A paper describes a structure:
A promising strategy in cancer immunotherapy is activation of immune signalling pathways through antibodies that target co-stimulatory receptors. hIgG2, one of four human antibody isotypes, is known to deliver strong agonistic activity, and modification of hIgG2 hinge disulfides can influence immune-stimulating activity. Furthermore, we explore structure-guided design of the anti-hCD40 antibody ChiLob7/4 and show that engineering additional disulfides between opposing F(ab’) arms can elicit conformational restriction, concomitant with enhanced agonism. For the most biologically active variant, C232S κC214S, disulfide linkages between C127 and C233 on opposing heavy chains were identified and termed a disulfide cross-over (amino acid numbering follows Kabat nomenclature, κ stands for the κ-light chain). Given this consistency across four different cellular read-outs, we conclude that engineering additional disulfides to link opposing antibody F(ab’) arms results in a compact and rigid antibody molecule with augmented biological activity.
The software predicts pairs of amino acids, based on a given structure, that will likely form disulfides if mutated to cysteine, and identified the amino acids T222 and κE123 on opposing heavy and light chains outside the hinge. Again, assuming the hinge disulfide cross-over is maintained, the C232S + T222C κE123C + κC214S variant was named cross-over + T222C κE123C. The cross-over + T222C κE123C variant migrated as a single species at ~150 kDa, suggesting the presence of additional disulfides linking heavy and light chains together. X-ray crystal structures were determined from pepsin-digested F(ab’)2 fragments. Anomalous electron density confirmed that the structure-guided design process was successful, with disulfides forming as intended. In the cross-over + T222C κE123C variant, the disulfide cross-over formed (C127-C233) in addition to two disulfides (C222-κC123) linking opposing heavy and light chains on opposite F(ab’) arms. This observation readily explains why the light and heavy chains did not dissociate on SDS-PAGE or CE-SDS despite the fact that the C127-κC214 disulfide, which would normally link heavy and light chains, cannot form. The designed variants are slightly more compact with hinge angles of 125.3° for the cross-over + K228C and 124.9° for the cross-over + T222C κE123C, compared to a hinge angle of 126.6° for the parent.
Numbering used by the authors:
A (entry chain B), D (entry chain B): 1 to 212
B (entry chain A), C (entry chain A): 1 to 102, 106 to 137, 142 to 195, 199 to 227
Write the structure that this text describes.
């Protein structure tokens, strides 16, 4: 069956720049190509059909180009709402086939995280587990470091993290680290802190609480 | 106008069978062709098949000739698609789509239906508040943990609050149960903050007020 | 050994009918006579009737000859008593009792069954925490309000905590709904405090953790 | 039918004292009288039968006395566990009849209330009503005064109270006052206080909180 190849599966670009996502068929598909945009929530819109043709709604900074085995979608002016994975599809032959996706990041000016720490609920201590949560909010770029200290003793291999998709209004991330202790362990210690390193912080930031 | 509303998530037995629903509105149903698409967690998109509602005829991708089986009730404006003998390879999101002809393309997508396949039985989540201790920016959230399988919805004030919210991707734990965080930032009358968790695979709905203790002696 | 466990509370339609249950254990049932007693909110005690289980024969108080009607299933070790065309005057607690003969007396009582009679439909309660702001004696509680009819149970840690607890009598409000307070005093590891409300007439059970926010920045 | 009369329906007595609850039939009942004890929870125990005879369990500070139309239950040494409403019953004639009850208080040494105030939950403000709760704990005697001030302005006709039965271990009361405002009204004011007058307080006690 006709393979659709998008060799570059992750591309990042500046608000403003022209961007070009690329699609290659194994053989000629006669401009029988469509381009799909998939937002982080998972919703899938249809941008361009028959190579060059814009589905109503789509702004005219989207352009379809190409022929034969080679097709491009280009976004001329780049804006935050354009954060998505873009896919190509051919209807030249059955089965219908899709490119493996190009995930597009937006590059914007550095912005440090706001940091919040949240202690476990009393309702949680009943479980026998405690969960301390640290929140890094609206930062760019995505690269960030989070260290858990307990009573000023650095923790290891007892934390899990999670990071949002980039926001489609201000092009930032947010991040959620979760330290997990036993009730026993959580109530052997007074101080709980997360310390954050990020490009936009001239020096690290520690947020703490003091149990009891 | 035009919508395709899909059956809620599914946990499924490794060996079972499942009929997904796609309830259509805003067009005359039989005047458009319905295709189904698979998306595995790597986020590749495969075409599964197509059905003509007017008629009932079909054209399956041969990848799924054994697995999937599509049908329509003209009346209820609703197509379906049944996976047979599910393995773990069936664990995916499943969109239903409409074909427009200008030529061809898929101009309206469902939101999708997450299917999971596992022996592991359902477990709905515990929901705990996240509230700080001590700027015109304070944060609350609530912590949705130890649930299975993967899909939970999280809302604030029944949909009222969208600005400030970040619901984080889940993390699988050593337990084999997932766990999620949802947080809101706010300006600093005392509006309440209520997080509405819906875990459909266990029929677990929870509304947890997150109490900010401002008062002092 | 010996018990008489009674049907849970009842809201009832002004005109309806109701069969109370009295499930007996710890004695051979037919070897003792069963009487029923009424207690109106003024707390006067009236004798309603008597039934011999072995036989099924009865002797009603003539006050209630029309209203009440007693029976037994030998098998399930269980007597019953059915109020007909209930007015508001039927709104009372109803004990079942056993007769001992040494002579006669009622040596084992049920806990009682509250019957209410009203058009007003059921409403289960909202439950809110009570937690202070700022001794080796701190207080928490939780607030059970706007429910109907009158009986709610309140527990702490599923029965674990008895010392320190005071569940207050309810107050009828201008609304026509009742409202109650339950409070615990404590010594000052951080044990949790969970108040378990059961309002059987609405099948409303709630478990509310009461969060004491000790931590500081 | 045979009326049973207990003329005194509320009697209070000191830990230690002898107490005598009294019962009068309309006509001779031939010592066919029983005495019942009813605890505040509502449970109903059987104390004495055939006038003078103690149901196993009952301690021997309970005594049954009398004949004809006149019968007495006396508690010789009084203790806190004896807080109850005691009832007489006759089995002389059907229908079986009961005395209208004697509620017995225990008199003990004065003890002031511990006072706690509790502000409304945020979960409650959604309702559109606010409930501030004041708690007077383990006091004697039962007589007490509770005033709600809001921003040092004395409230009126917006509060309801409730008082427990006397405890059967330490012979005290506790009390729950509830001020009820609209969300609108509760958030127009900063200070909320209840002030308590009781015999055991040389001067009044105010507990306050400061909203926001």
């Amino acid at each position: 069956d006709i393979q659709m190849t998008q060799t570059t599966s992750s591309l990042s670009a500046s608000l403003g720049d022209r961007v070009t996502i690329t699609c290659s068929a194994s053989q000629g598909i006669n401009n029988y190509l469509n381009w799909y945009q998939q937002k982080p929530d998972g919703t899938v819109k249809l941008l361009i059909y028959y190579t060059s043709s814009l589905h109503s709604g789509v702004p005219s900074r989207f352009s379809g180009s190409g022929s034969g085995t080679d097709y491009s979608l280009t976004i001329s002016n780049l804006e935050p709402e354009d954060i998505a994975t873009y896919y190509c599809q051919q209807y030249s032959n059955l089965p219908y086939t899709f490119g493996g996706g190009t995930k597009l990041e937006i590059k914007r000016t550095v912005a440090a995280p706001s940091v919040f720490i949240f202690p476990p609920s009393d309702c949680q201590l009943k479980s026998g587990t405690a969960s301390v949560v640290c929140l890094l909010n609206n930062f760019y770029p995505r690269e960030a470091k989070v260290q858990w200290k307990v009573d000023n003793a650095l923790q290891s291999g007892n934390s899990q993290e999670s990071v949002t998709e980039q926001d489609s209004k201000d092009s930032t991330y947010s991040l959620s680290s979760t330290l997990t202790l036993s009730k026993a362990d959580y109530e052997k210690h007074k101080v709980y802190a997360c310390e954050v390193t990020h490009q936009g912080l001239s020096s690290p930031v520690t947020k703490s609480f003091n149990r009891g | 106008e035009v919508q395709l509303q899909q059956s809620g998530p599914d946990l499924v037995k490794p060996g079972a069978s499942v009929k997904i629903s796609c309830k259509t509105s805003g067009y005359t149903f039989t005047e458009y062709i319905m295709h189904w698409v698979k998306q595995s967690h790597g986020k590749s998109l495969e075409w599964i098949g197509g059905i003509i509602p007017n008629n009932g005829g079909t054209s399956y991708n041969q990848k799924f000739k054994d697995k999937a089986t599509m049908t329509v009730d003209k009346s209820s404006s609703t197509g379906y698609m049944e996976l047979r003998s599910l393995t773990s390879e069936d664990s995916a999101v499943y969109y239903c789509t409409r074909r427009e002809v200008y030529y061809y393309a898929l101009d309206y997508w469902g939101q999708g239906t997450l299917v999971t396949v596992s022996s592991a039985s359902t477990k709905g989540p515990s929901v705990f508040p996240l509230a700080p201790c001590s700027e015109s920016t304070a944060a609350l959230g609530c912590l949705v943990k130890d649930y299975f399988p993967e899909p939970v919805t999280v809302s604030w004030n029944s949909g009222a609050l969208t600005s400030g919210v970040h619901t984080f991707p889940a993390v699988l734990q050593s337990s084999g149960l997932y766990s999620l965080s949802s947080v809101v930032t706010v300006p600093s009358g005392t509006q309440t903050y209520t997080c509405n968790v819906d875990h459909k695979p266990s029929n677990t709905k929870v509304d947890k007020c997150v109490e900010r203790k401002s008062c002092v002696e």
